Symmetry: C2
Amino acid sequence: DDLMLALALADRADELTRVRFGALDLRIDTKPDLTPVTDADRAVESDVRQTLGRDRPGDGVLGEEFGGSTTFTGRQWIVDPIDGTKNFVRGVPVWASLIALLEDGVPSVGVVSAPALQRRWWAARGRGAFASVDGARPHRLSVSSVAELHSASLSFSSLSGWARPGLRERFIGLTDTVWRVRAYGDFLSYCLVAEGAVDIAAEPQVSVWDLAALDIVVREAGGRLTSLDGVAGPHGGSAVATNGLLHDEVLTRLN
Amino acid sequence: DLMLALALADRADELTRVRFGALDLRIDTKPDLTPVTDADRAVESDVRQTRDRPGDGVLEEFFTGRQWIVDPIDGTKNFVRGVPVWASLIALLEDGVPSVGVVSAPALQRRWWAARGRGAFASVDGARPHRLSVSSVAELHSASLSFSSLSGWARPGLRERFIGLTDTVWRVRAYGDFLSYCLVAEGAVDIAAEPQVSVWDLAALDIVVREAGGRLTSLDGVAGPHGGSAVATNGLLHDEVLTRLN
Ligand SMILES: N[C@H](COP(=O)(O)O)Cc1c[nH]cn1
Ligand SMILES: N[C@H](CO)Cc1c[nH]c[nH+]1
Ligand SMILES: [Zn+2]
Ligand SMILES: [Zn+2]
Ligand SMILES: [Zn+2]
Ligand SMILES: [Zn+2]
């Protein structure tokens, strides 16, 4: 089945990314040469496309690095080989491959694979969400039971993205009200929500390649993921993930 | 002295790993800090007990000559929620100047250490140690910054200034607590800053940052761990960072 293949693709991407991460010349003195990450990002995409072309010939593929059909029909794989390239290039291990199958534009299978954090998160529709640490036996994920905002832990990415001068004030406001604030960034915030270690994750601009695997993992863990406008799923352009209980309050404070 | 510190961390790692694993992670309100206070006390007691170096003093749970300073669990608010960003900080101070430091985060499978004049190192999953050096980033507009949370920056003007700083740098995260500083020492980040931080929380970090070639000061530019706040950088960026915050 489809989950088994997605997990296999992540195993393969992990081999490709691990070696390249290790190979990086980490000496730096200005904004980093994104070049070797673009190389690695392209290499892993090409390899996933080649495997997909063989082993599920029918299904479409959309790639962040190379491209795919712009519309969203039938079975379609969506792949971001390295989410967190800006960490990758600095030697910061917060980066992952995101591999997701969409059925008529609805995420049905998700894998987030972060070999340099020795972690994987995955989910298939109606089958639950899971995580492994250092390849050890998988644990079923569930969101937290935190019902009050004043008791909630939030993780974000960076303050700059919250562009609108009012939305920034509103978001800064939200950080003042919650119990705990960090910014683990990118995919990590959302996986932590799914794990129930964090209660809220928010990003003001985020693409479908970056959200697709997360949407299914969050949901199968019991959580909710929507745009800032409350539209469910990965196509919103922004994402707020919560344990569900907190969702409407979070969205209300942000609007 | 260094060998002893690394040994104390090995022992603290055994105590902390088991207790982190043992935690009941179901939660619906602010977390019961109780099991972390228990673990914190347990590790401190066991370090106090560990004996060899009987002459030396010991100072978070329970500044003359040889004094050990120990925070057994930095990042207790992570520990209690199941977030693996937490560590033991073990440091030796000589007349109030850090000479030996170990940061051990077994849940991240990482350790960072330094002794005066001997350099700074890190291990990942017990694999062969690497010598650390800070980055060579000279321009603020190209710098990566990591902090803790925004609320700590209390003063309405200092907050605006800090928010400003985040707007100007190339990359902003908040990995939090000890992690930000260790990343500076690794050269993976160029600036780390916290507006309220205790000597127990900075002592191991001061030596690690400096042996890696960086600088660590208060927000008022007082060098070392006693300043009540900390800014660590690769050195090159230090004065510009302090100036923008003052
Ligand atoms: N920093 C990201 C650019 O690189 P990448 O897509 O190759 O990781 C943008 C991003 C993705 N998720 C969160 N932010
Ligand atoms: N924050 C991650 C939580 O799994 C671990 C980490 C961050 N940086 C390095 N390691
Ligand atoms: Zn990418
Ligand atoms: Zn991406
Ligand atoms: Zn502390
Ligand atoms: Zn701390």
